[PDB]
Enzyme design. Structure first.
Site, PDB file in Angstrom:
ATOM      1  N   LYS A 115      11.722   4.502  -4.078  1.00 36.83           N
ATOM      2  CA  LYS A 115      10.440   4.267  -3.428  1.00 36.83           C
ATOM      3  C   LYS A 115       9.414   5.200  -4.109  1.00 36.83           C
ATOM      4  CE  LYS A 115      10.417   3.817   1.266  1.00 36.83           C
ATOM      5  NZ  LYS A 115       9.811   3.682   2.621  1.00 36.83           N
ATOM      6  N   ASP A 175      12.843   2.520   6.469  1.00 35.59           N
ATOM      7  CA  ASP A 175      11.447   2.884   6.719  1.00 35.59           C
ATOM      8  C   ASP A 175      11.166   3.626   8.018  1.00 35.59           C
ATOM      9  OD1 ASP A 175      10.227  -0.145   5.005  1.00 35.59           O
ATOM     10  OD2 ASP A 175      11.136   1.678   4.209  1.00 35.59           O
ATOM     11  N   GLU A 226      10.879  -6.853   7.863  1.00 36.00           N
ATOM     12  CA  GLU A 226      10.618  -6.172   6.573  1.00 36.00           C
ATOM     13  C   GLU A 226      11.375  -4.870   6.432  1.00 36.00           C
ATOM     14  OE1 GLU A 226       8.419  -7.606   8.748  1.00 36.00           O
ATOM     15  OE2 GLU A 226       6.387  -7.345   7.924  1.00 36.00           O
ATOM     16  N   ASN A 227      11.695  -4.215   7.579  1.00 41.46           N
ATOM     17  CA  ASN A 227      12.393  -2.924   7.636  1.00 41.46           C
ATOM     18  C   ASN A 227      13.884  -3.058   7.920  1.00 41.46           C
ATOM     19  OD1 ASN A 227       9.805  -1.869   7.268  1.00 41.46           O
ATOM     20  ND2 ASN A 227       9.545  -1.365   9.423  1.00 41.46           N
ATOM     21  N   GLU A 231      19.272   4.523  -0.607  1.00 42.94           N
ATOM     22  CA  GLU A 231      20.381   3.602  -0.725  1.00 42.94           C
ATOM     23  C   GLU A 231      19.769   2.202  -1.027  1.00 42.94           C
ATOM     24  OE1 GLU A 231      22.668   3.131   2.916  1.00 42.94           O
ATOM     25  OE2 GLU A 231      23.708   1.367   2.098  1.00 42.94           O
ATOM     26  N   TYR A 232      20.386   1.487  -1.981  1.00 35.27           N
ATOM     27  CA  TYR A 232      19.964   0.143  -2.358  1.00 35.27           C
ATOM     28  C   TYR A 232      20.748  -0.863  -1.520  1.00 35.27           C
ATOM     29  CZ  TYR A 232      20.277  -4.190  -5.217  1.00 35.27           C
ATOM     30  OH  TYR A 232      20.338  -5.502  -5.608  1.00 35.27           O
ATOM     31  N   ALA A 233      20.005  -1.780  -0.900  1.00 40.77           N
ATOM     32  CA  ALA A 233      20.550  -2.865  -0.096  1.00 40.77           C
ATOM     33  C   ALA A 233      20.493  -4.145  -0.982  1.00 40.77           C
ATOM     34  CB  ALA A 233      19.734  -3.030   1.173  1.00 40.77           C
ATOM     35  N   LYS A 271       0.874  -1.174   0.000  1.00 40.28           N
ATOM     36  CA  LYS A 271       0.000   0.000   0.000  1.00 40.28           C
ATOM     37  C   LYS A 271       0.908   1.220   0.000  1.00 40.28           C
ATOM     38  CE  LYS A 271      -4.346  -1.561   0.230  1.00 40.28           C
ATOM     39  NZ  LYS A 271      -4.837  -2.956   0.067  1.00 40.28           N
ATOM     40  N   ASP A 302       8.817   1.116  14.503  1.00 36.07           N
ATOM     41  CA  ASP A 302       8.402   0.122  13.512  1.00 36.07           C
ATOM     42  C   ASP A 302       9.511  -0.888  13.154  1.00 36.07           C
ATOM     43  OD1 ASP A 302       6.362  -0.998  11.854  1.00 36.07           O
ATOM     44  OD2 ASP A 302       6.922   0.254  10.137  1.00 36.07           O
TER      45      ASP A 302
HETATM   46  C1  EML Z   1      16.671 -10.485  -6.413  1.00 34.16           C
HETATM   47  C2  EML Z   1      17.406 -11.200  -5.317  1.00 34.16           C
HETATM   48  N1  EML Z   1      17.767 -10.524  -4.069  1.00 34.16           N
HETATM   49  C3  EML Z   1      18.190  -9.076  -4.200  1.00 34.16           C
HETATM   50  C4  EML Z   1      17.339  -8.039  -3.504  1.00 34.16           C
HETATM   51  C5  EML Z   1      17.762  -6.767  -3.116  1.00 34.16           C
HETATM   52  C6  EML Z   1      16.730  -6.042  -2.509  1.00 34.16           C
HETATM   53  N2  EML Z   1      16.793  -4.752  -1.978  1.00 34.16           N
HETATM   54  C7  EML Z   1      15.742  -4.082  -1.367  1.00 34.16           C
HETATM   55  N3  EML Z   1      14.530  -4.697  -1.126  1.00 34.16           N
HETATM   56  C8  EML Z   1      13.439  -4.064  -0.546  1.00 34.16           C
HETATM   57  C9  EML Z   1      12.153  -4.801  -0.405  1.00 34.16           C
HETATM   58  C10 EML Z   1      13.578  -2.761  -0.131  1.00 34.16           C
HETATM   59  N4  EML Z   1      14.804  -2.166  -0.332  1.00 34.16           N
HETATM   60  C11 EML Z   1      15.171  -0.897   0.066  1.00 34.16           C
HETATM   61  C12 EML Z   1      14.340   0.118   0.828  1.00 34.16           C
HETATM   62  C13 EML Z   1      13.388  -0.204   1.792  1.00 34.16           C
HETATM   63  N5  EML Z   1      12.912   0.987   2.208  1.00 34.16           N
HETATM   64  N6  EML Z   1      13.508   2.021   1.586  1.00 34.16           N
HETATM   65  C14 EML Z   1      14.398   1.540   0.715  1.00 34.16           C
HETATM   66  C15 EML Z   1      16.535  -0.823  -0.320  1.00 34.16           C
HETATM   67  N7  EML Z   1      17.006  -1.936  -0.920  1.00 34.16           N
HETATM   68  C16 EML Z   1      15.878  -2.766  -0.921  1.00 34.16           C
HETATM   69  S1  EML Z   1      15.360  -7.100  -2.547  1.00 34.16           S
HETATM   70  N8  EML Z   1      16.045  -8.325  -3.232  1.00 34.16           N
HETATM   71  C17 EML Z   1      18.312 -11.384  -2.993  1.00 34.16           C
HETATM   72  C18 EML Z   1      19.501 -12.257  -3.484  1.00 34.16           C
HETATM   73  C19 EML Z   1      18.866 -10.640  -1.827  1.00 34.16           C
HETATM   74  C20 EML Z   1      17.209 -12.205  -2.286  1.00 34.16           C
HETATM   75  O1  EML Z   1      15.909 -11.604  -2.439  1.00 34.16           O
END
Ligand code: EML
Length: 252
Positions: free
Chosen positions: A37, A149, A135-136, A86-88, A18, A131
């Site tokens: 986002k 988050d 998930e966060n 930032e990408y995780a 959502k 929170d």
């Molecule tokens: C496709 C295989 N993957 C890669 C991956 C990387 C992700 N990175 C992220 N996922 C989510 C939901 C949120 N993210 C934020 C974020 C949250 N809030 N604001 C910013 C930042 N980076 C992410 S998901 N899957 C594996 C191998 C890790 C397993 O799944």
């Protein structure tokens, strides 16, 4: 920087829910890979989340810590609000839990210390997350935990303490409860107050009703029992958690 959608190449959706979705994106000029986002103005206004959005923007752009997900900027158009994050690369601790079923004491104590250091930082700056949940919690390229988050941050009920669920006054000790819930979930594979209904979960939280499976260690049982206290002031300081014997013996 002004920033527009035309400056980014959008990739696959990383997470859906959502308000909008999080996408993998790349800034065109720099080739900088980030998490975009994309939040819809329609749902933000039809819920009154405008303040929580400003709080995530203000807190995450100003907080600088290796265990906290960075917010680089933001922009918006006629329909959407875009947060440049930032990408995780190693995804959520939520996903890791589903795959692994449950974690060993070494992974648990490592995640708890990383979370405690970041929370100690937030709390010194009077910032309470409220929170904290799998998930966060995100994973960096070296498998380091990062909190994301900060929308619900201020200065299901599963991770909420009795103060919050009962609508009472609350402080930094909310994040200490959440850490206790996370510690149990990391080791067991399910949160301590899980129930098939909201009414049942509410009941279990307010009464602090949880039991440990046989595989839960004495030191782990001890730490969790200290964090999972109905009385906020009875919950230990983050430094007491970092100094805990089970943490010092199993963490990295
Ligand atoms: C496709 C295989 N993957 C890669 C991956 C990387 C992700 N990175 C992220 N996922 C989510 C939901 C949120 N993210 C934020 C974020 C949250 N809030 N604001 C910013 C930042 N980076 C992410 S998901 N899957 C594996 C191998 C890790 C397993 O799944």
């Amino acid at each position: 920087r002004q920033w527009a959608l035309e400056d980014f190449e959008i990739g696959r959706p990383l997470g859906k829910g959502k308000f909008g979705n999080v996408y993998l994106a790349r800034e065109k000029q720099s080739k900088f890979i980030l998490a975009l986002k994309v939040l819809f103005k329609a749902q933000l206004e039809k819920a009154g989340v405008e303040h929580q959005l400003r709080r995530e923007v203000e807190i995450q752009s100003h907080l600088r810590h290796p265990n906290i997900l960075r917010l680089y900027g933001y922009f918006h158009d006629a329909t959407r609000v875009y947060l440049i994050l930032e990408y995780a690369p190693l995804g959520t601790v939520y996903r890791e839990l589903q795959k692994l079923s449950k974690f060993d004491e070494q992974r648990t104590a490592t995640y708890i210390t990383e979370l405690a250091n970041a929370l100690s930082y937030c709390h010194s700056k009077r910032v309470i997350h409220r929170d904290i949940k799998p998930e966060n919690l995100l994973l960096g390229s070296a498998g380091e935990l990062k909190i994301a988050d900060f929308g619900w941050s201020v200065h299901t009920l599963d991770y909420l303490p009795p103060e919050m669920i009962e609508g009472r006054m609350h402080d930094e000790k909310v994040d200490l409860w959440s850490l206790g819930v996370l510690c149990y979930e990391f080791l067991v594979g399910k949160p301590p107050f899980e129930a098939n209904t909201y009414q049942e979960t509410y009941k279990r939280i307010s009464r602090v009703e949880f039991t440990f499976p046989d595989f839960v260690t004495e030191g782990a049982r001890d730490l969790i029992s200290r964090l999972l206290k109905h009385n906020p002031s009875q919950r230990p300081m983050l430094r007491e958690v970092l100094e805990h014997p089970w943490i010092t013996a199993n963490s990295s």
